[PDB]
Design a protein around this ligand. Structure first.
Ligand SMILES: O=C(N1CCc2ccc(O)cc2C1)C(F)(F)F
Lengths: 229, 10
Protein backbone atom coordinates (compact mmCIF):
# COMPACT_ATOMS: atom_id res chain seq x y z
CA UNK A 1 0.00 0.00 0.00
CA UNK A 2 1.44 3.34 -1.15
CA UNK A 3 2.49 5.30 2.00
CA UNK A 4 3.99 2.22 3.72
CA UNK A 5 5.60 1.04 0.51
CA UNK A 6 7.24 4.42 0.07
CA UNK A 7 8.44 4.49 3.71
CA UNK A 8 9.91 0.98 3.28
CA UNK A 9 11.85 2.09 0.18
CA UNK A 10 13.02 5.17 2.09
CA UNK A 11 14.26 2.98 4.92
CA UNK A 12 15.83 0.56 2.43
CA UNK A 13 18.28 3.12 0.96
CA UNK A 14 21.81 1.69 0.88
CA UNK A 15 24.65 3.49 2.61
CA UNK A 16 26.86 5.98 0.75
CA UNK A 17 30.12 4.13 -0.14
CA UNK A 18 33.18 6.19 0.53
CA UNK A 19 36.14 6.17 -1.79
CA UNK A 20 38.85 8.74 -2.56
CA UNK A 21 40.81 9.85 -5.69
CA UNK A 22 44.30 8.24 -5.79
CA UNK A 23 47.21 10.38 -4.70
CA UNK A 24 48.79 10.27 -8.22
CA UNK A 25 47.14 11.87 -11.36
CA UNK A 26 44.53 9.56 -12.90
CA UNK A 27 45.52 7.14 -15.68
CA UNK A 28 43.10 5.04 -17.73
CA UNK A 29 44.01 2.14 -15.47
CA UNK A 30 43.68 3.99 -12.15
CA UNK A 31 40.45 5.72 -13.02
CA UNK A 32 38.89 2.33 -13.93
CA UNK A 33 40.28 0.84 -10.70
CA UNK A 34 38.52 3.53 -8.71
CA UNK A 35 35.21 3.18 -10.50
CA UNK A 36 35.10 -0.63 -10.44
CA UNK A 37 36.24 -0.81 -6.79
CA UNK A 38 33.34 1.57 -6.03
CA UNK A 39 30.89 -0.37 -8.20
CA UNK A 40 31.81 -3.69 -6.55
CA UNK A 41 31.17 -2.23 -3.08
CA UNK A 42 27.90 -0.62 -4.09
CA UNK A 43 26.85 -3.95 -5.62
CA UNK A 44 27.34 -5.62 -2.20
CA UNK A 45 25.02 -3.02 -0.70
CA UNK A 46 22.53 -3.27 -3.59
CA UNK A 47 21.74 -6.90 -2.67
CA UNK A 48 20.80 -5.88 0.91
CA UNK A 49 18.73 -3.06 -0.54
CA UNK A 50 16.79 -5.41 -2.89
CA UNK A 51 16.16 -7.78 -0.02
CA UNK A 52 14.38 -5.01 1.91
CA UNK A 53 11.85 -4.30 -0.85
CA UNK A 54 8.65 -6.07 0.40
CA UNK A 55 8.04 -9.34 -1.49
CA UNK A 56 11.50 -9.47 -3.10
CA UNK A 57 12.81 -12.31 -0.88
CA UNK A 58 9.49 -14.17 -1.49
CA UNK A 59 10.28 -14.41 -5.20
CA UNK A 60 12.15 -17.58 -6.20
CA UNK A 61 15.97 -17.54 -5.90
CA UNK A 62 16.21 -17.64 -9.71
CA UNK A 63 13.96 -14.64 -10.00
CA UNK A 64 15.86 -12.65 -7.43
CA UNK A 65 19.14 -13.58 -9.11
CA UNK A 66 17.79 -12.80 -12.52
CA UNK A 67 16.38 -9.31 -11.78
CA UNK A 68 19.62 -8.35 -10.01
CA UNK A 69 21.78 -9.60 -12.94
CA UNK A 70 19.65 -7.72 -15.33
CA UNK A 71 19.33 -4.35 -13.52
CA UNK A 72 22.51 -3.76 -11.41
CA UNK A 73 24.25 -1.32 -13.70
CA UNK A 74 20.97 0.58 -14.24
CA UNK A 75 20.58 0.79 -10.41
CA UNK A 76 24.21 1.88 -9.94
CA UNK A 77 23.63 4.52 -12.53
CA UNK A 78 20.31 5.67 -11.21
CA UNK A 79 21.82 6.10 -7.65
CA UNK A 80 24.74 8.04 -9.32
CA UNK A 81 22.33 10.36 -11.19
CA UNK A 82 20.35 11.01 -8.01
CA UNK A 83 23.59 11.93 -6.19
CA UNK A 84 24.57 14.24 -9.02
CA UNK A 85 21.21 15.87 -9.74
CA UNK A 86 22.09 19.20 -8.08
CA UNK A 87 25.58 19.39 -9.60
CA UNK A 88 25.53 20.16 -13.36
CA UNK A 89 28.68 19.10 -15.26
CA UNK A 90 29.71 16.69 -12.43
CA UNK A 91 29.19 13.04 -11.49
CA UNK A 92 29.08 12.54 -7.74
CA UNK A 93 30.47 8.96 -7.48
CA UNK A 94 31.23 9.50 -3.76
CA UNK A 95 31.69 12.51 -1.48
CA UNK A 96 35.36 12.42 -2.20
CA UNK A 97 35.14 11.15 -5.78
CA UNK A 98 33.46 13.93 -7.74
CA UNK A 99 34.38 13.70 -11.47
CA UNK A 100 34.12 16.66 -13.83
CA UNK A 101 32.69 15.68 -17.19
CA UNK A 102 36.01 16.28 -18.88
CA UNK A 103 37.72 13.73 -16.63
CA UNK A 104 36.04 10.99 -18.63
CA UNK A 105 38.50 11.84 -21.43
CA UNK A 106 40.95 9.93 -19.21
CA UNK A 107 39.48 6.54 -20.26
CA UNK A 108 38.77 5.50 -23.92
CA UNK A 109 34.99 5.12 -24.40
CA UNK A 110 33.96 6.60 -21.02
CA UNK A 111 33.24 10.26 -21.99
CA UNK A 112 30.22 9.14 -24.03
CA UNK A 113 28.81 7.30 -21.03
CA UNK A 114 29.44 10.31 -18.73
CA UNK A 115 27.61 12.41 -21.31
CA UNK A 116 24.59 10.10 -21.37
CA UNK A 117 24.55 9.97 -17.54
CA UNK A 118 24.94 13.75 -17.37
CA UNK A 119 22.12 14.37 -19.90
CA UNK A 120 19.72 11.98 -18.14
CA UNK A 121 20.63 13.70 -14.85
CA UNK A 122 19.81 17.16 -16.41
CA UNK A 123 16.45 15.78 -17.59
CA UNK A 124 15.69 14.62 -14.00
CA UNK A 125 16.90 18.06 -12.77
CA UNK A 126 14.60 19.87 -15.26
CA UNK A 127 11.65 17.69 -14.21
CA UNK A 128 12.51 18.44 -10.53
CA UNK A 129 12.56 14.77 -9.58
CA UNK A 130 11.53 14.42 -5.96
CA UNK A 131 13.18 12.03 -3.48
CA UNK A 132 10.10 9.89 -3.22
CA UNK A 133 9.69 9.64 -6.97
CA UNK A 134 13.34 8.57 -7.18
CA UNK A 135 12.71 5.86 -4.59
CA UNK A 136 9.83 4.44 -6.66
CA UNK A 137 11.67 4.78 -9.97
CA UNK A 138 14.78 2.97 -8.64
CA UNK A 139 12.65 0.10 -7.29
CA UNK A 140 10.76 0.03 -10.64
CA UNK A 141 14.12 -0.46 -12.39
CA UNK A 142 14.82 -3.47 -10.21
CA UNK A 143 11.40 -4.97 -10.82
CA UNK A 144 10.89 -4.04 -14.51
CA UNK A 145 13.23 -6.31 -16.43
CA UNK A 146 12.29 -8.78 -19.33
CA UNK A 147 11.95 -12.16 -17.83
CA UNK A 148 10.86 -14.49 -20.60
CA UNK A 149 10.09 -17.84 -18.92
CA UNK A 150 13.21 -19.57 -17.55
CA UNK A 151 13.22 -23.28 -17.18
CA UNK A 152 14.19 -23.92 -13.54
CA UNK A 153 3.65 -18.10 -9.07
CA UNK A 154 6.89 -16.16 -8.72
CA UNK A 155 6.07 -14.26 -11.95
CA UNK A 156 2.57 -13.19 -10.68
CA UNK A 157 4.20 -12.24 -7.40
CA UNK A 158 6.61 -10.08 -9.54
CA UNK A 159 3.71 -8.45 -11.39
CA UNK A 160 1.88 -7.61 -8.07
CA UNK A 161 5.10 -5.97 -6.74
CA UNK A 162 5.78 -3.88 -9.78
CA UNK A 163 2.12 -2.96 -9.78
CA UNK A 164 2.29 -1.81 -6.17
CA UNK A 165 5.48 0.21 -6.88
CA UNK A 166 3.91 1.87 -9.94
CA UNK A 167 0.83 2.64 -7.85
CA UNK A 168 3.10 4.18 -5.21
CA UNK A 169 4.67 6.40 -7.85
CA UNK A 170 1.25 7.55 -9.18
CA UNK A 171 0.29 8.26 -5.50
CA UNK A 172 3.48 10.24 -4.96
CA UNK A 173 2.81 12.32 -8.08
CA UNK A 174 -0.86 12.96 -6.98
CA UNK A 175 0.59 14.91 -4.04
CA UNK A 176 1.75 17.72 -6.25
CA UNK A 177 -1.90 18.75 -6.89
CA UNK A 178 -1.24 19.42 -10.62
CA UNK A 179 -3.86 18.84 -13.37
CA UNK A 180 -4.93 15.31 -14.15
CA UNK A 181 -3.35 15.79 -17.56
CA UNK A 182 -0.08 17.06 -16.10
CA UNK A 183 0.01 14.10 -13.70
CA UNK A 184 -0.17 11.77 -16.73
CA UNK A 185 2.52 13.72 -18.59
CA UNK A 186 4.89 13.69 -15.58
CA UNK A 187 4.38 9.90 -15.19
CA UNK A 188 5.15 9.53 -18.88
CA UNK A 189 8.17 11.78 -18.67
CA UNK A 190 9.57 9.81 -15.75
CA UNK A 191 8.98 6.34 -17.29
CA UNK A 192 10.25 7.37 -20.66
CA UNK A 193 13.54 8.07 -18.95
CA UNK A 194 13.74 4.33 -18.04
CA UNK A 195 14.85 3.64 -21.65
CA UNK A 196 17.69 6.18 -21.33
CA UNK A 197 18.82 4.47 -18.12
CA UNK A 198 18.71 1.06 -19.80
CA UNK A 199 20.58 2.48 -22.75
CA UNK A 200 23.40 4.03 -20.63
CA UNK A 201 23.47 0.73 -18.69
CA UNK A 202 24.08 -1.15 -21.88
CA UNK A 203 26.99 1.11 -22.85
CA UNK A 204 28.44 0.87 -19.29
CA UNK A 205 28.19 -2.97 -19.33
CA UNK A 206 29.85 -3.25 -22.74
CA UNK A 207 32.55 -0.79 -21.60
CA UNK A 208 33.42 -2.84 -18.57
CA UNK A 209 33.21 -6.23 -20.41
CA UNK A 210 35.67 -4.88 -22.97
CA UNK A 211 38.00 -3.33 -20.28
CA UNK A 212 38.04 -6.71 -18.60
CA UNK A 213 39.15 -8.23 -21.92
CA UNK A 214 41.90 -5.75 -22.53
CA UNK A 215 43.15 -6.42 -18.86
CA UNK A 216 42.97 -2.58 -18.62
CA UNK A 217 41.73 -3.30 -15.10
CA UNK A 218 41.57 -6.40 -12.97
CA UNK A 219 38.04 -6.92 -11.64
CA UNK A 220 37.18 -8.75 -8.42
CA UNK A 221 34.57 -10.64 -6.48
CA UNK A 222 30.93 -9.65 -6.86
CA UNK A 223 31.59 -7.32 -9.77
CA UNK A 224 33.67 -9.96 -11.61
CA UNK A 225 30.95 -12.54 -10.89
CA UNK A 226 28.16 -10.24 -12.22
CA UNK A 227 30.20 -9.54 -15.35
CA UNK A 228 31.09 -13.20 -16.03
CA UNK A 229 27.36 -12.99 -16.92
CA UNK B 1 28.29 -19.13 -11.57
CA UNK B 2 26.34 -16.96 -9.16
CA UNK B 3 28.49 -18.57 -6.55
CA UNK B 4 28.67 -15.25 -4.55
CA UNK B 5 25.30 -13.63 -5.35
CA UNK B 6 23.43 -16.85 -4.24
CA UNK B 7 25.55 -16.58 -1.15
CA UNK B 8 24.50 -12.97 -0.34
CA UNK B 9 20.79 -13.58 -1.13
CA UNK B 10 20.39 -16.68 1.14
O1 LIG C 1 32.27 1.68 -14.61
C1 LIG C 1 31.39 2.47 -14.94
N1 LIG C 1 30.66 3.18 -14.03
C2 LIG C 1 29.52 4.05 -14.43
C3 LIG C 1 28.39 4.00 -13.36
C4 LIG C 1 28.74 3.74 -12.01
C5 LIG C 1 27.79 4.02 -11.05
C6 LIG C 1 28.05 3.80 -9.67
C7 LIG C 1 29.31 3.27 -9.34
O2 LIG C 1 29.63 3.04 -8.03
C8 LIG C 1 30.27 3.00 -10.30
C9 LIG C 1 29.98 3.25 -11.64
C10 LIG C 1 30.99 2.98 -12.59
C11 LIG C 1 31.02 2.54 -16.44
F1 LIG C 1 31.23 3.65 -16.95
F2 LIG C 1 29.71 2.33 -16.58
F3 LIG C 1 31.80 1.48 -17.12
Amino acid sequence: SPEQLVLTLLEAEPPHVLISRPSAPFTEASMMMSLTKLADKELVHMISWAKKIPGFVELSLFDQVRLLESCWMEVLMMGLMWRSIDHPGKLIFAPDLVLDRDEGKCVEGILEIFDMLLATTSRFRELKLQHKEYLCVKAMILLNSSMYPLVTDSSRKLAHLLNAVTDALVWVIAKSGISSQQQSMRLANLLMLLSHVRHASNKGMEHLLNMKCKNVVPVYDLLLEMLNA
Amino acid sequence: RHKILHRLLQ
